[PDB]
UniProtKB/Swiss-Prot annotation, chain A:
Similarity comment: family membership: Belongs to the herpesviridae major capsid protein family.
UniProt name for this protein: Major capsid protein
Phylogenetic classification of the source organism: Viruses, Duplodnaviria, Heunggongvirae, Peploviricota, Herviviricetes
Gene: MCP
Subunit note: Homomultimer. Makes the hexons and eleven out of twelve pentons. Interacts with triplex proteins 1/TRX1 and 2/TRX2; adjacent capsomers are linked together in groups of three by triplexes, heterotrimeric complexes composed of one molecule of TRX1 and two molecules of TRX2. Interacts with scaffold protein; this interaction allows efficient MCP transport to the host nucleus. Interacts with capsid vertex component 2/CVC2. Interacts with the small capsomere-interacting protein/SCP.
Species of the source: Human cytomegalovirus (strain AD169) (HHV-5)
Top-level taxon: Viruses
Role this protein plays: Self-assembles to form an icosahedral capsid with a T=16 symmetry, about 200 nm in diameter, and consisting of 150 hexons and 12 pentons (total of 162 capsomers). Hexons form the edges and faces of the capsid and are each composed of six MCP molecules. In contrast, one penton is found at each of the 12 vertices. Eleven of the pentons are MCP pentamers, while the last vertex is occupied by the portal complex.
Location(s) in or outside the cell: Virion; Host nucleus
Curated annotation (Swiss-Prot), chains B, C:
Complex and partners: Homomultimer. Makes the hexons and eleven out of twelve pentons. Interacts with triplex proteins 1/TRX1 and 2/TRX2; adjacent capsomers are linked together in groups of three by triplexes, heterotrimeric complexes composed of one molecule of TRX1 and two molecules of TRX2. Interacts with scaffold protein; this interaction allows efficient MCP transport to the host nucleus. Interacts with capsid vertex component 2/CVC2. Interacts with the small capsomere-interacting protein/SCP.
Family designation: Belongs to the herpesviridae major capsid protein family.
Name listed for the protein in its UniProt record: Major capsid protein
Lineage of producing organism: Viruses, Duplodnaviria, Heunggongvirae, Peploviricota, Herviviricetes
UniProt function note: Self-assembles to form an icosahedral capsid with a T=16 symmetry, about 200 nm in diameter, and consisting of 150 hexons and 12 pentons (total of 162 capsomers). Hexons form the edges and faces of the capsid and are each composed of six MCP molecules. In contrast, one penton is found at each of the 12 vertices. Eleven of the pentons are MCP pentamers, while the last vertex is occupied by the portal complex.
Species annotation: Human cytomegalovirus (strain AD169) (HHV-5)
Source species, domain of life: Viruses
Location of this chain's protein in the cell: Virion; Host nucleus
Protein's gene: MCP
Amino acid sequence: VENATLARQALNRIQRSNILQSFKAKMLATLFLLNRTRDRDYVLKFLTR
Amino acid sequence: FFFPVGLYLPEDRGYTTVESKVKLNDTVRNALPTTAYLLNRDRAVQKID
Amino acid sequence: FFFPVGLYLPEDRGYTTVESKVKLNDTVRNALPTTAYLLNRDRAVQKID
Amino acid sequence: PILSTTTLALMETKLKGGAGAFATSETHFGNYVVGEIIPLQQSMLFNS
Amino acid sequence: PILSTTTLALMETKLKGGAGAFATSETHFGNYVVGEIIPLQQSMLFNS
Amino acid sequence: LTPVTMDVNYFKIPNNPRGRASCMLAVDPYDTEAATKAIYDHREADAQT
């Protein structure tokens, strides 16, 4: 959703690399968030997004 | 961005400001730094020489 | 503004109040100062000799 | 300038340090660090 | 008086200090810093 | 290339890697001789260092 607007052809290599970097960052960030963080703003923003 | 590598600070005006926090063993290989350390896109250390 | 340079504190009354924070290597250039450092318009270090 | 260091020790101290440590410019005998002036490395990482 | 030092070591000690660290004077065996009585350096730059 | 004993404090601030600032908002307009003197005349002091 945060990189759907720039790719307008077949995925150029740099875009795929960006996808992979975001994959690794978001995967490490998201694992078990409810057990990890318990403040209202983060949970509400996560569910809304 | 720019960054220096291989510099040599003056010895007669030598000084330390982290003595309580870090310590290095006595070896000239440490005394005259021939390499530099920098940060990758992800927070990982890179080693240029 | 006024600021001093080249001053000699008495040795027979010497003292330190920053020993846990900073440590200067043994060299007479550090022991007897002949330089002063001041700030420019921008918060950067300048040297007077 | 970008966060650079001439020995692994100071780099490890920078990693162990909390938020806001990257702006510091500590030095040693013949080893030193140059801290980033814009806090780019902390601000960029947060948004993945 | 204006913030001045006889050795870069105490200057680097001052640069890492928190808010208002410039005001306090410090001395060593044969080196010293004199703090600026007016907090001009913090106040002026604080405006951005 | 850069000499071994370069003053490292030059690198701790936003600066020009050439070692001598050449920002053209400082020079007088259309004074080509003044601008080239600012850039290349090493018998007159640089700005900001």
